[PDB]
Amino acid sequence: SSCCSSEDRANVMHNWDAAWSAAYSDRRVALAQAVFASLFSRDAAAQGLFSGVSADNPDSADFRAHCVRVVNGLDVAINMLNDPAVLNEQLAHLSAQHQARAGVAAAHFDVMAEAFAEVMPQVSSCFSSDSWNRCFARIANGISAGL
């Protein structure tokens, strides 16, 4: 298991901040939509888990709001990377929320990680892939703990 270092966190926070649209939801929705399209392509069964947010129509307001929630959740976690005591509470919170969704499993987080790794180089300038991979693991593993 490769550690998400101080340097990695700086790289990830930089890439994430530089690509962020701070006042409008459109960009974060586009990012998440691409992530979910990749996730569902890789794991067709995973889409069923999202029936409660209209995943069948990814352009729907229902699904777009889910996209906002997921990207916000990741944004909050990324911004906590330099305060890991706080990060741990946040990841435990997200973990509880995912434990409450029947069928969500640790394996899905590996596929989600593949999806972000595919999408982030398409939205982020000078994207640091190794730092992203290590720090996404730090975050994802905290959420998937207990499932």
Query: Which residue lies nearest Ca ion, judged by its C-beta?
Result: 26
At 21, list the tokens.
Answer: 């649209």
- Residues near Ca ion (CB under 5 A): 26
Alpha carbons 37 and 39: distance in angstroms, whole number: 6
Give which of ligand HEM, Cl ion, Ca ion, none residue 27 binds (C-beta under 5 to 8 Å, depending on kind): Cl ion
CA atoms within 13 A on the CB side of 7: 5
If the CB atoms of residues 50 and 132 are measured against ligand HEM, the closer one turns out to be: 50
Can you tell me whether residue 24 is helix, strand or coil?
A: coil
Name the residue type at position 10: A
Judged by the rule CB under 8 A, the positions of this chain that interact with other proteins are 2-7, 10, 13, 17-19, 21-31, 33-34, 61-62, 64-65, 68-69, 72-73, 75-76, 78-80, 82-90, 93, 117-119, 121-123, 125-130, 138
